[PDB]
Design a protein around this nucleic acid. Structure first.
Lengths: 134, 80, 94, 107, 91, 91, 80, 107, 94
DNA sequence: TCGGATGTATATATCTGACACGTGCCTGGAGACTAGGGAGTAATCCCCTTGGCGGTTAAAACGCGGGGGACAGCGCGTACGTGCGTTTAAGCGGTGCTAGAGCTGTCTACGACCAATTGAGCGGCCTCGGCACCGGGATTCTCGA
DNA sequence: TCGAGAATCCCGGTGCCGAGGCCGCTCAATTGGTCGTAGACAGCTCTAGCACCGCTTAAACGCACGTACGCGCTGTCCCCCGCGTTTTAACCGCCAAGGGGATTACTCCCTAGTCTCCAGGCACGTGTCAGATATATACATCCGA
């Protein structure tokens, strides 16, 4: 589980480019600020994952920022009600991301649909367009 | 609704008829699923290690043969 | 652009040489491709050790002649120990 | 400035000398590779392939087929004793087994 | 009666016996319990490698086991006949 | 009666059982039937390698064989128990 | 006056008592000599090949271990 | 012009780095040998020897001896499961066997 | 004169370190001498293949890790890789 | 226990999907030569195997007589194979999609090589002492009632 | 059960030889410095693989089945065990001789290495036919009736 949390964490850090590794990893604040204490990309994940033992659904929110720095590969209780990962919102430019759709499978491609105003595709459109009063 | 129960009773019997087995007791269907499950866990463990060494997310046929190579059961017919 | 290679032509040449009108399936080439590589690996792998065992650094004809002397059951080996010896003198002629 | 004469042709064999001699260096078996080694080796490889196909054709011939199927290899190896002592560990995909009914199951 | 026909029929042919789609769901589920469970794609050629290697293991296993049935003065096979044959093999 | 004492005595110690001088005459005679029969000298350390490897093979062989004796409902071992155990091992 | 008859009946029994064998039939003494004689012919054949490769007339302990190495029964305790 | 500091000491290990790094080139395993390889390898070798001796001493301690005999190694490996899965093929000279009376031979 | 090497002085450190009082015979060092070579054979002999398998011609620390992952059984391997990973970090510490 | 129905078999038919064979090409084997280093050959030093006796002493062969096992045979009782009507999920195609496999192209960190430069490590050398072995001897032992 | 029963194990002997430790020493390990290059790394891209749904139909599930089949059964009895005594040879030491394993200095021939041509192989391409499954008409074998 925490292994499977680390496996989503290890693959996410490896997927980002090292020309912008320190930029987007600082935007997640998954670790703390000054704790980033540069040489080898494969070795940097080997220390940061052991550095992820401090702060320990806990780490997928960094990937929703990773879709902002890579956007070419594709109340607000109107999504968490569909609990039959889960939804992982993030504030924004007045909208949010989802990174939601999964049994538990959060390392597969979850859907991404903002709102600026597989088989799960058949019902994820139903819970959205809830048409509340906002 | 279990995958290990996806190995039916006649399919197990189909294996033993090829092995020259006349008559099979009823407790075999639990043991044979147990033997098969261990035999895959000594291969899929080894096959995924090659799959994660060359940094990929897909097992190849050469990955299985390499796992069966060190296992000591060489399988021809696929090769490089 | 994916310029790979195998022993596909050479098996078919041997089969045609000793059998006039006998064909082979493309699945059965995958046998013979996997066959000859496994024999090649076990022979060269074993004869690699005899150089290291007897401290020399040079795989010659003599190691293979004692590698095939070990890697086969002996009755099949009695022709194989003489087949290459028939051939290796022929190369040094021309 | 002469014509390129193949060492396999000069050996009078069928298996490629020059491919084996390239593979035997790059396979990292030793430091130095003798000239007489991968010309002695190809004949050993040629004698084995000529052995098992000669049994494979007879499996094809007796089963009324001019095309060798992979099962005919399986029937060739297990009917031989000495090749079975070589290949008893190795299995064959699409091979099947011998038609082996055990003895005392009969009226 | 028929079983002897069944033995000579299956030892004649060489096609696979375990059906592929349940066998595919089994192998993918075992792969989840390694590499911390992300998933892995499978070449369709590569899943046939297991389904060859699984049956060739088991068919060779029962022939070693069924000798022990006849050695025990029995004809019907037993799980005692299985685990002992696995034990003497040494793996 | 005594045989159970004999088993615990021999499984206690670890010294060799086959006496060396008949075992040496056996191995030298087999070596004559190879290399066209000249002779070969033997390091006295090297003949102990066989006498270790022979007994460690056979003691491991009977433990695999004696399981088949108990599996057959028997206690007394038989040559049928030997050759079958050699057969399932695969060498 | 035969060397294969240099393996006495109690010496064969000494092996089987270590193997945990209670009671031994009388026909074993022919089979065990047969099994032992084959096991040496799969080793002394291989051990003398190393002995004749490095052009000597004396088998060493390393010659036997190398023969047992490819045989698949590694024997420690002697080494290099 | 500094003092010769051992890489094994710099690793804080016990098995020699410099001997392994010399053997791993001359054993003809590959062409190029990384620097981090024979410092990762010696710790793996150190962990195994520290494993089996720690069982060997307990065989020595329980049998009232301060000197490890080779039989204590044999009793250590076969009483472990996982080492027996490693060394089940390998025998041991002057080892003997387990004190293994099979079950149903008793009054 | 000749000169022959072993691992015996290094092992006698380890035995003294895990037990400050336990001694060892001469024959058991020959057990351990043949033991550690055979482990050194099968690890490097496997790790050489992965360089051949994935076409890079440089054995690094990573290829030893996956070979130890293959050779050792699943429970004993988990410590030794951690014992391995602890070693290289201290090596890169200075 | 013959009819006989149930299994066997060339024959044919088409249909097809694999495959044998033509072709362009292009990367790799070959030719020819160069140096230098392995290693073969030759000569030698003593190490260790070989082949003697004596003779000793446990080992082993002979032979029995005991009973414990093997085993043939037979009781029931039971679990599995065969049919068979009833689910059902595998398969196949089939379409839509894409995530990863793999390939190509720069940058550089990282190993190889080389040459000095010590000390850790290897054979002698010796001295202690742990295991080894004898029997007292203090426990802890087995079937006549 | 009882009892004496040898039997079991423990313990305080001499004592040996052998690991444990210390000693000259060398050579292989490490340090210092130089190079290229493998390989790391990021970037396109099109192949292969997952998903899904439909329709399937062959496959499986249950079950009633009787009918074989495990097996405990007891009696029989040839065939190991144990013991005991009388041959037999393995064994230790000892010795003596010596082929034969290791080492050493030797020269050169084989083999890497280079670089410079060319063509045998590879991928790719359509013809077509073995063969396979198709359906028969035809020839033999014994299953319950």
């Amino acid at each position: 589980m925490d292994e499977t949390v680390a496996e989503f964490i290890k693959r996410t850090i490896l997927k980002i480019p090292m020309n912008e590794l320190t930029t987007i990893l600082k935007a997640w604040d998954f670790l703390s600020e000054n704790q980033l204490q540069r040489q080898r990309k494969e070795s940097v994940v080997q220390h940061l994952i052991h550095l992820c033992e401090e702060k320990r659904s806990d780490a997928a929110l960094l990937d929703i920022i990773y879709m902002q720095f890579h956007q070419h590969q594709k109340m607000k209780q109107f999504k968490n009600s569909f609990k039959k990962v889960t939804v992982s919102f993030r504030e924004t430019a007045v909208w949010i991301r989802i990174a939601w759709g999964t049994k538990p499978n959060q390392y597969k491609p979850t859907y991404v649909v903002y709102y600026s105003q597989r088989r799960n595709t058949p019902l994820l459109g139903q819970a959205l367009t809830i048409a509340s009063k906002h | 609704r279990d995958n290990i129960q996806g190995i039916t009773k006649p399919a197990i019997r189909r294996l033993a008829r090829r092995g020259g087995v006349k008559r099979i007791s009823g407790l075999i269907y639990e043991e044979t699923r147990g033997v098969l499950k261990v035999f895959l866990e000594n291969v899929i463990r080894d096959a995924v290690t090659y799959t994660e060494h060359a940094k990929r997310k897909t097992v190849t046929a050469m990955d299985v043969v390499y796992a069966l190579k060190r296992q000591g059961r060489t399988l021809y017919g696929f090769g490089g | 652009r994916s310029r790979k290679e195998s022993y596909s032509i050479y098996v078919y040449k041997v089969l045609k040489q000793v059998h006039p009108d006998t064909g082979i399936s493309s699945k059965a080439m995958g046998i013979m491709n996997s066959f000859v590589n496994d024999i090649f690996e076990r022979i060269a792998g074993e004869a690699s050790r005899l150089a290291h065992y007897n401290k020399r650094s040079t795989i010659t004809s003599r190691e293979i002649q004692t590698a095939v002397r070990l890697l086969l059951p002996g009755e099949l080996a009695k022709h194989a120990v003489s087949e290459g010896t028939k051939a290796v003198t022929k190369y040094t002629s021309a | 400035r002469a014509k390129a004469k193949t060492r396999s042709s000069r050996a009078g064999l069928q298996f490629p000398v020059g491919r084996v001699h390239r593979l035997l260096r790059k396979g990292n078996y030793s430091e130095r590779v003798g000239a007489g080694a991968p010309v002695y080796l190809a004949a050993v490889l040629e004698y084995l392939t000529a052995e098992i196909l000669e049994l494979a054709g007879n499996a094809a011939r007796d089963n009324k087929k001019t095309r060798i199927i992979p099962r005919h290899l399986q029937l060739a190896i297990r009917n031989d004793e000495e090749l079975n002592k070589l290949l008893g560990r190795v299995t064959i995909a699409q091979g099947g087994v011998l038609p082996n009914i055990q003895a005392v199951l009969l009226p | 009666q028929g079983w002897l026909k069944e033995i000579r029929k299956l030892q004649k042919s060489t096609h696979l016996l375990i059906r592929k789609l349940p066998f595919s769901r089994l192998a993918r589920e075992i792969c989840v319990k390694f590499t911390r469970g992300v998933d892995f794609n499978w070449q369709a050629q590569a899943l046939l490698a297991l389904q060859e290697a699984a049956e060739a293991f088991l068919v060779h296993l029962f022939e070693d086991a069924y000798l022990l049935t006849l050695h025990a003065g029995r004809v019907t096979l037993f799980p005692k006949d299985v685990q002992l044959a696995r034990r003497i093999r040494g793996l």
